[PDB]
Amino acid sequence: QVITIGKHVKGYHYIIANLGFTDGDLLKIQFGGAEVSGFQIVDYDDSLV
Amino acid sequence: NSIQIGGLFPRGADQEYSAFRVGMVQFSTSEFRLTPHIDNLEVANSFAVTNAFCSQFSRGVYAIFGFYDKKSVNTITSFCGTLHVSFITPSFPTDGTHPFVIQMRPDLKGALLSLIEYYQWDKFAYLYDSDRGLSTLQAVLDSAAEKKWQVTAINVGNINNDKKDETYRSLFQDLELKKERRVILDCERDKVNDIVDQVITIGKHVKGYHYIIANLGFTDGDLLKIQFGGAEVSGFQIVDYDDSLVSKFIERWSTLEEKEYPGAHTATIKYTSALTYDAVQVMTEAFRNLRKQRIEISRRGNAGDCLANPAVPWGQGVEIERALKQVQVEGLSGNIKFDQNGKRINYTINIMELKTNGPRKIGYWSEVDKMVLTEDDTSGLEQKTVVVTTILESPYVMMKKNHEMLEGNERYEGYCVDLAAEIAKHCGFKYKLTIVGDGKYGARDADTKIWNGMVGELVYGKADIAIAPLTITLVREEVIDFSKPFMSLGI
Amino acid sequence: NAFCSQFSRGVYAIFGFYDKKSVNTITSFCGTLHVSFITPSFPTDGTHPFVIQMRPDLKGALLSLIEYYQWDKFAYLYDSDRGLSTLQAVLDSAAEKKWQVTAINVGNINNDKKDETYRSLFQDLELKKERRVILDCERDKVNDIVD
Ligand SMILES: NS(=O)(=O)c1cc2c(cc1Cl)N[C@H]([C@H]1C[C@H]3C=C[C@@H]1C3)NS2(=O)=O
């Protein structure tokens, strides 16, 4: 709904309070201009991971 | 009289072919019938066009209907001007006046020039598609030179699919260099629905931008994407849904089965299919008028090779085209008339602007008359120029010597004039400078409390505000109010 | 007619010229029938098979000349008959290098008016007082316009 009403330009800023930050969709607002940060507990770089 | 005709159709124009099948029996059969031999073949290969054309000429039909592409228009004109066979099409208009070609699409270019002059731009960009031709590009550049415009045209059409997510980003970021604000698109609906999606992904549909679609099916594409945006989108329609026969065809079209006619069980329709439906009307009116004048079209023999050296044609087709240019009926686009060549005249195009509730019209444009807006003034909130009363006093409020040549708020000059300009600058409202009638400051009446002068103009709701040399007293706070005092004085 | 006639004659190698209106016809026939065609005419745009063409490209050298003379603002007079490929080409570089380009068609003017129409054209150029002109025509139109 944000991307429909056009509120993801440069200037805005967003914080997701979850654990699966990339577990949701992010290709929508990736190229926007806004800046999005969050949190992960599952780091894909590790060996057993 | 089942008369042999020929039909050319691309492999994918299913809505148009189904609309042709609808219009076939939508009105016919008190008389002559038609023999449509259909060729669901391609349009890019002019060799394929040639093969289909010589096949239908070996059939020996009396008229051929279909589409064409820009890589085939020369082939169609070259064979038709030779063999005198009248050809009718809904496609983009030809450039040169050619004989034996009747073309169903109206012009766009004069309308588009009218629209640009109405919005009064000076500088913009112009994304075009090569595969629809460049006639509009040639047209806009001349008037751009004359009307001192600054045009940044860019080809976009030859971009492949596999890079068609980053090409557009590079393109619009190059448009960000000059900080473009005004775009004209000129594409097919597929390219429109691609480019709007890429714009809405990169976030360029806020308030500030502005867009113009150069097509005929303005609402035939998707508009729920950028409807709530902030940007402003305008276009053009030739199929107006408000009319009686239009809505009759809408109901008749919506009630049909999708399985029998693909792409038919919807609410709206393509303008191409609409012109196909009207083409059946014209094509039947032709043979109707020939049986009115009782002129026999007996071929009286077979046709032969399309490569006949030299081939000799038959001028009853010239009389066919002569009767074709005189047809004047009503249809989905409205009234139709033709020139001496096969181009449409006497048409009308509605200007369609997108709003929050959805699309709406603001005016029409004719073949001869310019843009006539329909005066649709739904602006319910107008900031009223507030009532500012004062009195002439030097140097508070003074006349100017050239007040007759000047107008209104420009006529007055003084300390109060400058002050009122400052107040209106700081508060953002509109105002109009007026004068008290009786020429008094104002006091109350004995026994009736009738405040005259500038007092009763504010007491009795007449005037809105008074920036003027007025003195704060005790007897004036009861009826009106004052700000903090701004200039000291005494008797 | 000529092409079908000579293929009925059983030609092994076809040669000839073409204008802008027959180009699709020739490339369509040659792509189908796989017959080697050779030409000195204007080069095409899409990569088409069985078409060998002697006339070299011009657009890169012309752009290079533009960069060498180091211009920003100029007029460009073109004819349609030879094609519009260079017109499409220079406008992209105009968008990139932020040039001020004025392009005007000349090719439709009939011979009965080619003393005053050109005069009106140059007066409209003098409304901006252009100084840098690229002509793009054939030799006949060049000799007609320089006079
Ligand atoms: N020197 S003068 O008469 O023009 C003049 C007189 C006045 C001025 C400013 C000026 Cl320049 N502002 C004051 C206001 C400012 C603040 C303090 C009192 C009022 C609020 N009122 S005033 O005392 O009427």
Separation of B484 CA from ligand 1 center, angstroms? 8
Q: Are B333 and B278 in contact (CB under 8 A)?
A: yes
**Cα B51 to Cα A47: distance, rounded to the nearest angstrom:** 65
User: Which residues of B fall within a CB distance of 8 Å from C108?
Assistant: none
Contact across the interface for B169 and A31, Cβ inside 8 Å? yes
Q: Are B438 and B463 in contact (CB under 8 A)?
A: no
**Cα B336 to Cα B88: distance, rounded to the nearest angstrom:** 14
Q: Are B435 and B390 in contact (CB under 8 A)?
A: yes
Residue C146, SS3 per DSSP: helix
Spatial neighbors of B54 by CB under 8 A, at least 6 apart, are: B305, B306, B307
How wide is the angle at C-alpha B172 spanned by C-alphas B194 and C87, nearest 5°? 90
Contact across the interface for B174 and C95, Cβ inside 8 Å? yes
Strand partners, B387: B432
DSSP letter (8 states) at residue B441 = -
Burial class (CB in 10 A: 0-12, 13-18, 19+), B87: buried
Burial class (CB in 10 A: 0-12, 13-18, 19+), B76: buried
Nearest to B297 by CA among B286, B305, B307, B306: B286
Q: Are C71 and C55 in contact (CB under 8 A)?
A: no
Annotated binding residues of B for L-glutamate, written as ranges, equal 469, 471, 476
- C83: tokens are 């094609």
Half-sphere exposure of B440 (CA within 13 A, CB side): 10
Nearest to B210 by CA among B403, B337, B354: B354
**Cα B189 to Cα B212: distance, rounded to the nearest angstrom:** 13
Residue B286, SS3 per DSSP: helix
Write down the H helix ranges in B225-333.
244-254, 271-292, 316-324
**Cα B311 to Cα B380: distance, rounded to the nearest angstrom:** 69
Phi and psi for B196 in degrees, rounded to 5? Answer: -70, -35
**Cα B209 to Cα B181: distance, rounded to the nearest angstrom:** 5
Q: Return the exposure string of B422-460: e unless at least 16 CB atoms fall within 10 Å of the residue's CB, then b.
A: eebeeeeeebebbebeeeeebebeeeeeebbbbbbbbbe
| DSSP-assigned states of every residue in B115-168 | HHHHHT-SEEEEEE-GGG-SHHHHHHHHHHHHTT-EEEEEE-TT--STTTTTHH
* B423-432 CB contacts, 8 Å cutoff, 24+ apart: B423/B467, B429/B383, B429/B386, B430/B383, B430/B384, B430/B385, B430/B386, B431/B385, B431/B386, B431/B387, B431/B388, B431/B465, B432/B385, B432/B386, B432/B387, B432/B388, B432/B408
Write down the H helix ranges in A1-49.
2-5
- B348: tokens are 């009308």
Instruction: Count other C-beta atoms under 10 Å from residue B484's C-beta.
Output: 5
Alpha-carbon gap: B279 to the closest alpha carbon of chain A (Å) = 40
Chain B residues contacting A, CB < 8 Å?
169, 200-203, 205-206, 225, 228-230
Distances (CA, A) of C147 to B243, B362, C118, C120, C143: 58, 51, 11, 15, 6
Strand partners, B412: B399
Token pair 């072919």: residue: B17
- C75: tokens are 């007029």
Q: Are B406 and B417 in contact (CB under 8 A)?
A: no
Phi and psi for B2 in degrees, rounded to 5? Answer: -70, 105
Q: Among C29, C95, C103, whose Cβ lies nearest the Cβ of B141? A: C103
Residue C58, SS3 per DSSP: coil
Q: Are B474 and B480 in contact (CB under 8 A)?
A: no
Closest ligand 1 atom, CA of B486? 24
Alpha-carbon gap: B363 to the closest alpha carbon of chain C (Å) = 32
Q: Are B347 and B238 in contact (CB under 8 A)?
A: yes
- B369: tokens are 């008359």
DSSP letter (8 states) at residue B231 = S
Q: Are B91 and B103 in contact (CB under 8 A)?
A: yes
Count, residues in chain A = 49
Nearest to B36 by CA among B64, B5, B60, B9: B5
DSSP letter (8 states) at residue B408 = G
**Cα B156 to Cα C38: distance, rounded to the nearest angstrom:** 31
Sign of CA dihedral B413, B417, B421, B424: negative
Residue B345 is inside which H or E element, if any?
strand B344-345
Count, residues in chain C = 147
Residues with CB under 6 A from ligand 1: B 484-488
Token pair 């030879």: residue: C82
Residue B7, SS3 per DSSP: strand
**Cα A6 to Cα B95: distance, rounded to the nearest angstrom:** 42
Nearest to B444 by CA among B454, B432, B434: B454
Mutual angle of helices B189-202 and B167-175, in 10-degree steps: 70
DSSP letter (8 states) at residue B209 = B
Nearest to C101 by CA among B144, A5, B464: B144
**Cα B353 to Cα B236: distance, rounded to the nearest angstrom:** 8
Q: Are B264 and B18 in contact (CB under 8 A)?
A: yes
Q: Return the exposure string of B461-473: e unless at least 16 CB atoms fall within 10 Å of the residue's CB, then b.
A: eebbebbbbbeee
- B331: tokens are 């249809």
- B41: tokens are 């073949």
Residue B185, SS3 per DSSP: strand
SS3 letters across C69-100: HCCCEEEEEECCCCCCHHHHHHHHHHHHCCCE
Distances (CA, A) of B6 to A26, B36, B53, B54, B67: 53, 6, 9, 11, 12
Sign of CA dihedral C32, C36, C41, C47: positive
**Cα B445 to Cα B340: distance, rounded to the nearest angstrom:** 81
- B315: tokens are 């001028």
**Cα B419 to Cα B455: distance, rounded to the nearest angstrom:** 20
Chain A residues contacting B, CB < 8 Å?
3-6, 8-9, 28, 31-33
DSSP letter (8 states) at residue B176 = T
Touching subunits of A (3+ CB pairs, under 8 Å) are: B
User: Which residues of A fall within a CB distance of 8 Å from B202?
Assistant: 31-32
Spatial neighbors of B387 by CB under 8 A, at least 6 apart, are: B431, B432, B434, B462, B463, B464, B465
Examine residue B395 and say whether the peptide bond preceding it is cis (omega within 30 degrees of 0): yes
Half-sphere exposure of B356 (CA within 13 A, CB side): 3
Nearest to B466 by CA among B474, B475, B456: B456
Phi and psi for B289 in degrees, rounded to 5? Answer: -70, -30
Spatial neighbors of A23 by CB under 8 A, at least 6 apart, are: none
Instruction: Count other C-beta atoms under 10 Å from residue C10's C-beta.
Output: 6
User: Which residues of A fall within a CB distance of 8 Å from B206?
Assistant: 6, 9
Residue C132, SS3 per DSSP: coil
Token pair 């094609």: residue: C83
Order of strands, edge to edge, in the sheet holding B359-366?
B150-155, B123-128, B182-186, B210-213, B232-237, B348-354, B359-366, B372-373
Closest residue CA from atom 2 of ligand 1 = B487
Separation of B398 CA from ligand 1 center, angstroms? 23
In Å, the largest CA–CA distance within chain B is 116
Q: After which residues is chain C broken (C to N over 2.5 A)?
A: none
DSSP letter (8 states) at residue B364 = E
Q: Are B409 and B434 in contact (CB under 8 A)?
A: no
In Å, the largest CA–CA distance within chain A is 42
Contact across the interface for C25 and B46, Cβ inside 8 Å? yes
Sign of CA dihedral B319, B325, B329, B333: positive
Phi and psi for B162 in degrees, rounded to 5? Answer: -80, -10
Question: How many angstroms separate the first and last alpha carbons of chain A?
Answer: 34
Residue B190 is inside which H or E element, if any?
helix B189-202
Write down the H helix ranges in chain C.
2-9, 23-33, 59-69, 85-96, 117-126, 139-146
Contact across the interface for A9 and B230, Cβ inside 8 Å? no
Distances (CA, A) of C3 to C8, C15, C16, C28: 8, 10, 10, 12
- C15: tokens are 């040669």
Nearest to B195 by CA among B127, B246, B93: B127
- B49: tokens are 């066009």
Among C5, C20, C25, the strongest candidate for a mutation testing the B interface, having the largest count of B CBs within 10 A, is C25
**Cα C48 to Cα C45: distance, rounded to the nearest angstrom:** 8
DSSP letter (8 states) at residue C42 = -
